[PDB]
Amino acid sequence: NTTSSVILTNYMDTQYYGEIGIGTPPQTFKVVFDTGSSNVWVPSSKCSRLYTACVYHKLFDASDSSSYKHNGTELTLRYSTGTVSGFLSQDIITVGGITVTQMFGEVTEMPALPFMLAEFDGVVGMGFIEQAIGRVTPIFDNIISQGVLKEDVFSFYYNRDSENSQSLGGQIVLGGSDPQHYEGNFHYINLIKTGVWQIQMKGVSVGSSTLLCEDGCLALVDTGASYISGSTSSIEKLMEALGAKKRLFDYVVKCNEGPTLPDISFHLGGKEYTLTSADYVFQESYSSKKLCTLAIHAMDIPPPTGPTWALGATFIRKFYTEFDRRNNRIGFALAR
Amino acid sequence: NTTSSVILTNYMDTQYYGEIGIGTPPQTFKVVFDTGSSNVWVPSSKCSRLYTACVYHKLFDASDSSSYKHNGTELTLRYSTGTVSGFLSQDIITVGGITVTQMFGEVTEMPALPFMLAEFDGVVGMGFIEQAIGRVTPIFDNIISQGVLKEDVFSFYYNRDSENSQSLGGQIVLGGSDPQHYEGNFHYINLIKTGVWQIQMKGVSVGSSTLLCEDGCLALVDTGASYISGSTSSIEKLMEALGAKKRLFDYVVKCNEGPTLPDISFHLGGKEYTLTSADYVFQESYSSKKLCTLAIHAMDIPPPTGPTWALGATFIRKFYTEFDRRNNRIGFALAR
Numbered sequence: 001n002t003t004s005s006v007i008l009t010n011y012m013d014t015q016y017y018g019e020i021g022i023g024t025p026p027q028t029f030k031v032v033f034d035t036g037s038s039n040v041w042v043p044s045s046k047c048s049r050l051y052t053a054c055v056y057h058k059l060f061d062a063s064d065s066s067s068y069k070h071n072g073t074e075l076t077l078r079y080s081t082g083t084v085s086g087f088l089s090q091d092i093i094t095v096g097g098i099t100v101t102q103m104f105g106e107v108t109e110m111p112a113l114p115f116m117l118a119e120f121d122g123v124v125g126m127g128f129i130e131q132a133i134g135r136v137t138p139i140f141d142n143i144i145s146q147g148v149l150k151e152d153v154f155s156f157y158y159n160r161d162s163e164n165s166q167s168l169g170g171q172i173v174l175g176g177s178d179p180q181h182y183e184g185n186f187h188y189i190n191l192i193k194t195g196v197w198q199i200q201m202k203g204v205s206v207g208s209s210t211l212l213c214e215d216g217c218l219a220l221v222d223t224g225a226s227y228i229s230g231s232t233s234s235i236e237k238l239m240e241a242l243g244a245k246k247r248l249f250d251y252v253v254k255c256n257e258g259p260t261l262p263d264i265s266f267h268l269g270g271k272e273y274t275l276t277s278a279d280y281v282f283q284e285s286y287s288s289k290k291l292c293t294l295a296i297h298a299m300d301i302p303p304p305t306g307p308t309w310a311l312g313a314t315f316i317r318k319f320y321t322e323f324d325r326r327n328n329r330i331g332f333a334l335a336r
Numbered sequence: 337n338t339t340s341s342v343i344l345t346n347y348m349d350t351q352y353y354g355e356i357g358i359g360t361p362p363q364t365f366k367v368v369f370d371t372g373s374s375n376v377w378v379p380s381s382k383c384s385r386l387y388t389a390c391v392y393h394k395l396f397d398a399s400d401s402s403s404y405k406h407n408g409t410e411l412t413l414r415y416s417t418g419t420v421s422g423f424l425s426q427d428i429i430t431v432g433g434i435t436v437t438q439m440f441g442e443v444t445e446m447p448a449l450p451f452m453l454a455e456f457d458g459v460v461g462m463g464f465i466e467q468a469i470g471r472v473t474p475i476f477d478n479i480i481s482q483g484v485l486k487e488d489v490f491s492f493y494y495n496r497d498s499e500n501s502q503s504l505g506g507q508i509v510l511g512g513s514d515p516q517h518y519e520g521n522f523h524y525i526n527l528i529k530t531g532v533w534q535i536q537m538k539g540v541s542v543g544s545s546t547l548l549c550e551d552g553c554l555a556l557v558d559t560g561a562s563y564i565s566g567s568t569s570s571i572e573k574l575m576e577a578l579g580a581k582k583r584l585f586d587y588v589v590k591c592n593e594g595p596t597l598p599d600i601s602f603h604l605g606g607k608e609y610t611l612t613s614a615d616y617v618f619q620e621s622y623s624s625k626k627l628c629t630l631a632i633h634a635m636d637i638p639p640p641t642g643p644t645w646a647l648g649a650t651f652i653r654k655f656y657t658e659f660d661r662r663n664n665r666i667g668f669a670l671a672r
């Protein structure tokens with residue numbers, strides 16, 4: 001009978017991270033809570049300073065923790081936008097009043113691109129042990145083993161960005177869901193398969209037409225991804241209907257065209273989940289001379305997880321998301 | 337025991353709108369939530385494409401909704417600026433986690449001036465049944481009937497526009513208010529009568545002297561109007577005292593001089609509600625080589641409602657507003 005809310009910071013609507021403590025005394029780290037991966041890692045004090053990303057981030061020093069336990073097994077974590085490498089270490093980790101003995105990665109190789117653009121230091125995988133590298137027990141499995149949570153679930157609220165600092169960037173509840181940050185009722189979709197936060201998606205419509213995901217596709221619900229992503233061929237067609245021009249990494253429209261772009265809907269479990277243009281364009285201007293980025297990207301995720309769409313922070317911002325380990329399902333409700 | 341919020345989009349500080357769903361399944365429309373009118377309406381699928389506005393808006397297709405019930409009674413809705421016509425239909429409307437069977441207008445006539453400029457598709461009238469054309473029961477009355485709301489009130493937050501954020505454009509709350517977007521406590525002013533969201537104003541001060549509305553006048557609190565307005569005469573005097581001159585269509589001031597302009601105070605229920613020049617000058621720049629318009633316009637509203645001042649989006653931006661149907665009054669508090 002315990003819940004645990006961790007307050008998240010929202011950087012520019014693209015990064016959402018909260019604080020954890022590792023060691024004794026606690027060394028604090030900004031970390032993304034990430035259902036698209038299953039390992040915990042933070043930068044290490046053994047990371048050569050020729051990696052400038054390690055110069056600009058908090059580094060874990062095992063020599064300052066009395067509760068540290070050595071392992072030393074090498075590990076590499078491959079994310080869709082970048083890679084980190086290092087070795088395994090055990091210590092106590094605090095996540096919102098819960099304390100857990102956890103195996104995590106001390107990262108000694110941390111590419112400047114993209115990690116010099118990271119406001120966060122590391123990542124907390126909220127995914128399953130089946131996708132864990134080195135078969136390291138994920139942190140939420142260790143918390144479940146304590147038997148202190150009311151429900152074996154966790155939930156994500158990602159707020160819109162704000163100019164002031166009185167609005168919360170977001171929130172992860174461990175052991176439940178916060179009714180202050182959603183309205184209406186949860187609508188649940190079973191996982192295709194345990195081991196991945198991935199569900200069946202029946203269709204994707206853009207405007208007055210269902211031009212995408214005909215006959216079906218996959219949808220990984222990914223709190224560690226900034227954007228909604230689809231396959232390269234799915235997105236070239238999505239962005240033809242929008243009128244966006246393919247820039248280097250992102251897509252863009254003329255800023256004045258932003259508000260008139262069509263609704264994009266996502267058919268999940270007998271319910272339509274609809275984003276307006278306000279939800280997926282970074283409306284920085286109304287000028288026909290400036291360019292505005294869309295919060296939708298192309299990403300070709302390889303098997304066995306893909307090929308699939310990924311519903312990242314663009315989607316979760318609109319729909320409060322409950323991840324349910326007990327019944328292997330994902331619930332969505334309108335965020336507030 | 338229930339509250340229901342809808343996040344709103346701010347377009348250029350002159351349009352504010354959020355999502356509703358009509359039908360089964362729900363079709364998504366952007367609507368202005370409008371205390372200065374009492375009818376719901378969205379564009380119709382039957383709307384001829386000769387009206388260019390219908391080509392560039394979302395259309396309600398009654399054939400694609402299993403909850404739709406027919407009723408072809410005609411109606412014309414006349415606003416200050418534009419005019420639309422159509423016929424009545426019945427269906428379920430989703431307003432932020434609340435569902436309610438509602439009579440609204442499917443619109444088949446939709447002039448380019450001004451509805452081509454409308455970033456919203458339709459309007460949700462939050463006014464009283466007394467000003468409802470066709471005697472149609474307004475949506476808030478139907479929601480009161482299902483008896484789920486905490487209080488018989490609804491509130492409006494309209495945010496300032498910022499080009500360097502993806503900020504909350506605004507927020508309506510049905511059944512209460514959100515203290516995150518105001519400070520202190522509400523002070524209320526009773527309506528003159530039920531049926532119109534219209535209060536007594538005891539004067540409008542420009543700086544020190546109380547130059548206008550000396551012997552009292554009226555004030556519509558209108559969430560569907562973009563500006564504060566007064567009669568052509570009252571605005572003439574106000575603008576002469578501000579040092580503003582009629583450019584061609586609008587009143588302007590040198591952008592650099594904007595900050596020198598005096599406060600404007602609206603005396604409502606024994607308190608002074610004060611906008612600074614930052615609140616009522618659109619400072620697109622501060623250049624001494626450019627002109628800047630004011631968010632206050634002349635508008636001769638005809639009887640029986642007029643002639644009156646109207647406190648539109650300019651005013652609501654400054655003061656979070658709570659519309660209290662139980663007590664027939666309006667509460668203001670400083671927005672944040």
Ligand SMILES: CCc1nc(N)nc(N)c1-c1ccc2c(c1)N(CCCOC)C(=O)[C@](C)(c1cc(F)cc(F)c1)O2
Nearest residue numbers: 014015016032036037079081114117118223224225226
């Ligand atoms: C968290 C680890 C993670 N987990 C899964 N499942 N997917 C991705 N893409 C990532 C990931 C990796 C690296 C990475 C990020 C995400 N994020 C997004 C954080 C999301 O917060 C919720 C970034 O912002 C950053 C700095 C990045 C910035 C950038 F401008 C372009 C990039 F390609 C990557 O670097």
Ligand SMILES: CCc1nc(N)nc(N)c1-c1ccc2c(c1)N(CCCOC)C(=O)[C@](C)(c1cc(F)cc(F)c1)O2
Nearest residue numbers: 350351352368370372373415416417418450453454560
């Ligand atoms: C909501 C319906 C409404 N309700 C009442 N009470 N008054 C007015 N004037 C209106 C109204 C009618 C039409 C109309 C608008 C408001 N608004 C303002 C939306 C306000 O959002 C908070 C418009 O922006 C628009 C497109 C318009 C653009 C323009 F450049 C000149 C116009 F005359 C009208 O067209």
